[PDB]
Design a protein around this nucleic acid. Structure first.
Ligand SMILES: [Mg+2]
Ligand SMILES: [Mg+2]
Ligand SMILES: [Mg+2]
Ligand SMILES: [Mg+2]
Ligand SMILES: [Mg+2]
Ligand SMILES: [Mg+2]
Ligand SMILES: [Mg+2]
Ligand SMILES: [Mg+2]
Ligand SMILES: [Mg+2]
Ligand SMILES: [Mg+2]
Ligand SMILES: [Mg+2]
Ligand SMILES: [Mg+2]
Ligand SMILES: [Mg+2]
Ligand SMILES: [Mg+2]
Ligand SMILES: [Mg+2]
Ligand SMILES: [Mg+2]
Ligand SMILES: [Mg+2]
Ligand SMILES: [Mg+2]
Lengths: 117, 150, 103, 140, 56, 110
RNA sequence: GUAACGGGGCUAAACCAUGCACCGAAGCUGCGGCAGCGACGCUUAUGCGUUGUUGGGUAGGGGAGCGUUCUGUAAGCCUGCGAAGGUGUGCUGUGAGGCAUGCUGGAGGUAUCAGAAGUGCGAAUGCUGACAUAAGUAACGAUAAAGCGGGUGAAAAGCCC
RNA sequence: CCCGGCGAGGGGAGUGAAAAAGAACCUGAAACCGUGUACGUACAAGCAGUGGGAGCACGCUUAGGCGUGUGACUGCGUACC
């Protein structure tokens, strides 16, 4: 016969109020933040992690297109050479070879340049 | 509640408002909403359902409760002290247990924080039979077929 | 020697590096069984013989170490329209470590 | 590990010297805008701080293709209302290549901050070789 | 002349900048090896050198 | 307590007194005056009193006669504010909170 | 105020035709995991591994649960070798939440399965209280203004002479 | 006992298991207001976060490429009811 809301009352606010970052002004100090902002965070987060898979790919190719072309054949022709193979197909990501194993990479551009029929 | 008045707050205007009466369920003043009430509570169980499945004790609680002896006839006029003497014929004491002798004699002597209860009589519900460790049926013969009432 | 392979994402850039991956199947606990990867090898790629393929002869694989296959990570991730809120949700994996011997 | 080469905070800067005395005018901007970012560059992951270092010379030798020598809106309105808008055709402005024309790259960059880091920071001039008020050292 | 949302924090905390107080710096004068107050000689007797206000 | 003194009530508002306090810190001590005695704002007359009381506690709670010290701390807090009413336009624009503070002066070692 | 390519800028960075290549979504695939149903493998109350498939969602329908105050089980169990409550942390669950523990704290709390609800707030120009904001801003109530010397006093423009 | 106006207020000493129980007195949360320290910050535009992310302050480990804080720069991107 006792709601005595006080009992979870606190725990709930405290829960979301637990936004370490503090963000700014009311965004931590006032409960107002939670479903307004802590909620946005959940939303902005929901999409960015999955939308990110590509944002890096866009970078991966951005550099491959910037590395492979300097030594003949553009990114457009590159993957096409690479495309022809029985086992020769190791995708990008590691494609950053242009930063650590340049010799490999340029030795990989021939795997495509000389590969393009 | 102490509604010693009808709405005196002037509706349209005065800035934020919208009040009215004061047994107003929102006004900290008083007024408790969907109030409450004395009610009955007491639900009633059919007659057959009442006698249905009770002393399942014997079989299940076999190695525990289903003892039948005597109502202790030699017990003094009103003496509970040396109850122990008889409380040891089975070694069932504070373990709880209730007797079902069926004689409002002097054996109603059991008075304690909560151990042995008498109620030795037709009047008895399973609730009690199941509240104790080993309900000493006892009584003898009283435990007949359809009238195993203790 | 370098390393290279896919299996649930091309995660095999680093050489030995001992980095997380996926999960066995029936159960994780550690120990091992000695599972060679496959000749996805960049020919290992590492020496005077960095090779376009990776294909530099038959059979070339590293044995899996099976360092630690556990843990999780927790990420809230909750959507909500203007009238609802699936806000309440959680899905993770353990990504077994694996140190991987030499190429 | 997490692949992405870091941002050594504009690690290296390769110096260069275009000519501009050429005939490509507007076409040149792209290979001038791509350069101060991460064109010839492979590694040094762009998007983040970065750049290069080249430089223009006379540049005064441009004609564009069509009658653009005579067009190009060009106005540098000011916070002055009172009806301003300073429109001057290209040839009218080509008389003194300032923050414009040669500076056709500004509108071609990421714009705002950081892109702003490259901006005029390539130098322009309009006379090629003589008294290069710019850094004489290493260039190509 | 009404206002509408106003940020107690940050803002105002900025106008306070032009609100901090200031420091004097003055001498003691030959006689008083301390006080002298500001551009005054000394209050102890209110004398710059003799019979001024009350002194010897 | 590392020789304090502080205050409570009296009435002089927070910010009002928080202003003069900034004037004194760091060196202080030997500045029982001058950097205070030569500034007239009510808040000043109040911080000095407690300033001396504090520097005085240097002969009772602890030794270290008045001459060294530092005054590494001075902060005023909001103290219970009195409420009152104000006849105005029929009674709408009236709240008046007197406000009050303290000072809490300190004097430790450098 | 360019304002009838989004901007740059374009003689092809336009269009028309032809063909290849590349970028590109939560679409499809790969890998792992969750749940419902049909099957498969078996095992076989049952259940688990494989697999096919289904899993946007307002009104609204159905189905599962967490948590709180109070009652039974409870002079049983936990506690001053520190309960409830407040605050941090770590582990844990799909989530509601759960636990363990630092510190505070100064006396109580309650596994379990069951029972009953003043049973869960962010809004109703909601009700009560506390504290902000504007802002150290406006204002200090008749424009019959006051100056000086003494006194007293911690201090006097305002009090006494 | 000491500062002070024989103020207020406080600081010691003593009472007490505790005064981090002092009469405003149990526990004392939140808003709101301060002092201190680490980092960011005075050529940069917008629901202030989220994704990426260098540097810096501490903490790492017989490196092993990490934890906590802060976050320049950058893709996105108009609160809830
Ligand atoms: Mg590109
Ligand atoms: Mg009436
Ligand atoms: Mg209003
Ligand atoms: Mg009432
Ligand atoms: Mg009946
Ligand atoms: Mg943009
Ligand atoms: Mg493709
Ligand atoms: Mg995709
Ligand atoms: Mg659904
Ligand atoms: Mg309770
Ligand atoms: Mg609502
Ligand atoms: Mg004033
Ligand atoms: Mg104003
Ligand atoms: Mg004014
Ligand atoms: Mg007046
Ligand atoms: Mg208290
Ligand atoms: Mg700066
Ligand atoms: Mg991130």
């Amino acid at each position: 016969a006792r709601v005595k809301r006080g009992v979870i009352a606190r725990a709930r606010h405290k829960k979301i109020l637990k936004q370490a970052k503090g963000y700014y002004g009311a965004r931590s100090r006032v409960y107002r933040v939670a479903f307004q902002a802590v909620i946005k965070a959940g939303q902005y987060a929901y999409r960015d992690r999955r939308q990110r898979k590509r944002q890096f790919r866009q970078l991966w190719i951005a550099r491959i297109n910037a590395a492979a072309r300097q030594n003949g054949i553009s990114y457009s022709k590159f993957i096409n050479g690479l495309k022809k193979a029985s086992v020769e197909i190791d995708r990008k990501i590691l494609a950053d070879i242009a930063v650590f194993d340049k010799v490999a990479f340029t030795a990989l551009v021939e795997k495509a340049k000389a590969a393009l029929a | 509640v102490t509604g010693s008045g009808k709405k005196p707050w002037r509706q349209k205007g005065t800035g934020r408002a919208r009040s009215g009466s004061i047994k107003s369920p929102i006004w900290r003043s008083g007024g408790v909403t969907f109030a409450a009430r004395p009610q009955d509570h007491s639900q009633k169980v059919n007659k057959k359902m009442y006698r249905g499945a009770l002393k399942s004790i014997l079989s299940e609680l076999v190695r525990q409760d289903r003892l039948i002896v005597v109502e202790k006839f030699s017990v003094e006029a009103p003496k509970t002290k040396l109850l122990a003497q008889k409380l040891k014929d089975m070694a069932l004491e504070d373990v709880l247990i209730i007797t079902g002798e069926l004689d409002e004699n002097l054996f109603l002597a059991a008075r304690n924080l909560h151990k042995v209860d008498v109620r030795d009589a037709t009047g008895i519900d399973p609730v009690s039979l199941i509240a104790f460790d080993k309900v000493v049926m006892t009584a003898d013969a009283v435990k007949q077929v359809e009238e195993m009432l203790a | 020697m370098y390393a290279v392979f896919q299996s649930g994402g091309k995660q095999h850039r680093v050489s030995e590096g001992q980095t997380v991956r996926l999960e066995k199947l029936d159960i994780a606990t550690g120990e091992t069984v000695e599972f060679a990867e496959v000749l996805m090898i960049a020919n290992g790629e590492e020496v005077k013989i960095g090779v376009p393929f990776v294909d530099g002869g038959v059979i070339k694989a590293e044995v899996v170490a099976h360092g630690r296959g556990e843990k999780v990570k927790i990420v809230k991730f909750r959507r909500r329209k203007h009238y609802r809120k699936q806000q309440g949700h959680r899905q993770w994996f353990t990504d077994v470590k694996i140190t991987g011997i030499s190429a | 590990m997490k692949t992405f080469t870091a941002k050594p905070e504009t690690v290296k800067r390769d110096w260069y010297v275009v000519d501009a005395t050429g005939k490509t005018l507007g076409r040149l901007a792209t290979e001038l805008a791509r350069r101060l970012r991460g064109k010839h560059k492979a590694e040094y992951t762009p998007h983040v701080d970065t750049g290069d270092y080249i430089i223009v010379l006379n540049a005064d030798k441009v004609a564009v293709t069509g009658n653009k020598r005579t067009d190009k809106v060009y106005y540098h309105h000011t916070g002055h209302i009172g009806g301003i808008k300073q429109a001057t055709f290209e040839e009218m402005i080509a008389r003194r290549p300032e923050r414009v024309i040669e500076i056709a790259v500004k509108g071609m960059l990421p714009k705002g901050p950081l892109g702003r880091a490259m901006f005029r920071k390539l130098k322009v001039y309009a006379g090629n070789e003589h008294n290069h008020a710019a850094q004489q050292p290493q260039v190509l | 002349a009404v206002q509408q949302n106003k940020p107690t924090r940050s803002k105002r905390g900025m106008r306070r900048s032009h609100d901090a107080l200031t420091a004097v710096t003055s001498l003691s004068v030959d006689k008083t090896s301390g006080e002298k107050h500001l551009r005054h000689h000394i209050t102890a007797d209110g004398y710059y050198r003799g019979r001024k206000v009350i002194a010897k | 307590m590392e020789t304090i003194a502080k205050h409570r009530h009296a009435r002089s508002s927070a910010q009002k007194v928080r202003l003069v306090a900034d004037l004194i810190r760091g060196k202080k001590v030997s500045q029982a005056l001058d950097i205070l005695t030569y500034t007239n704002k009510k808040a000043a007359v109040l911080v000095k009193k407690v300033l001396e009381s504090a520097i005085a506690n240097a002969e009772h709670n602890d030794g270290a006669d008045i001459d060294d010290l530092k005054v590494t701390k001075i902060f005023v807090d909001e103290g219970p504010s009195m409420k009152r009413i104000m006849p105005r336009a029929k009674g709408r624009a009236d709240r008046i909170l007197k406000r009050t503070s303290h000072i809490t002066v300190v004097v430790s070692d450098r």
